[PDB]
């Protein structure tokens, strides 16, 4: 059975029946690493990047909140981490991020040990996910599809911005 994405290569089997399975796993990481771990990672990376990209672009198009610490004046999205970490913004958000991440680690452990928590599920805002499994699945693919794009998007923004010192267009 050949993969849809790479017709000349065999299909990755362990990834079958998963959201966003286009048959693309040329190096076969799935055959070796636990799938639930991989799935959780893809989702987390995507969600983080989605927000990261938005933040980068937003600040670059102005957006600074009010009142703004003086040290934060005249800072691009890039070259803002250090001013912020000095002020205390980064540290004050790191604390909460850490808390959630630690509890999440417990969830991941239980998921891998077999508890029933689907990878990436934190039971948040499921009300808007629809009722029919079909619509639920479409929503999930929507998140994943946007997420994959976001990962690539963020990379471009940060790399192009630093390399050529440019603003929003071609950030």
């Amino acid at each position: 059975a050949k993969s849809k994405a790479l017709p000349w290569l065999p299909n990755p089997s362990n990834l079958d029946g998963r959201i966003g399975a286009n048959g693309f796993d040329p190096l076969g990481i799935s055959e070796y690493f636990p799938v639930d771990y991989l799935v959780e990672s893809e989702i987390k990376h995507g969600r983080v990047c989605m927000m990261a990209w938005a933040g980068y672009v937003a600040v670059d198009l102005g957006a600074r909140i009010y009142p703004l610490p003086e040290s934060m004046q005249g800072v691009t999205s890039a070259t803002a981490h250090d001013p912020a970490v000095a002020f205390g913004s980064m540290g004050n958000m790191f604390i909460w991020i850490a808390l959630f991440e630690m509890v999440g680690w417990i969830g991941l452990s239980q998921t891998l040990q077999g508890s029933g928590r689907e990878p990436g599920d934190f039971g948040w805002g499921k009300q808007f996910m629809g009722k029919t499994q079909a619509e639920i699945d479409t929503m999930k693919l929507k998140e994943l599809t946007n997420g994959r794009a976001a990962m690539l998007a963020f990379a471009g923004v940060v790399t192009q911005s630093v390399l050529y010192d440019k603003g929003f267009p071609y950030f």
């Binding site: 055959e31 070796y32 636990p34």
Partner: protein, 89 residues
């Protein structure tokens, strides 16, 4: 369970992940890891042997430190490749 007999151990002893990896892949990884470790050592050696400029322990670099850990991994990976080969996978 892990008790084994013969001339080669079963793949179960290589863990829950490497037990499914092909022998060749492990070999490639092993060689690469050893290379990184050796490179790190040689490069760091120059830093330690360069006149002055290493005061306050400036010779210690985060990348080289991490790279140096490839050496032990190289051993493990090369041993694992052999086990996988004998096991047929």
């Amino acid at each position: 369970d892990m008790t084994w007999e013969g001339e080669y151990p079963p793949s179960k002893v290589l863990g829950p992940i490497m037990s499914k990896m092909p022998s060749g892949l492990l070999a490639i990884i092993s060689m690469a890891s050893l290379g990184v470790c050796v490179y790190s050592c040689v490069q760091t050696g120059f830093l330690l042997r360069e006149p002055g400029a290493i005061e306050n322990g400036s010779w210690v670099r985060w990348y080289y430190v991490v790279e140096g850990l490839g050496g032990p991994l190289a051993w493990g990976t090369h041993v694992a490749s052999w086990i996988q080969r004998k096991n047929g996978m």
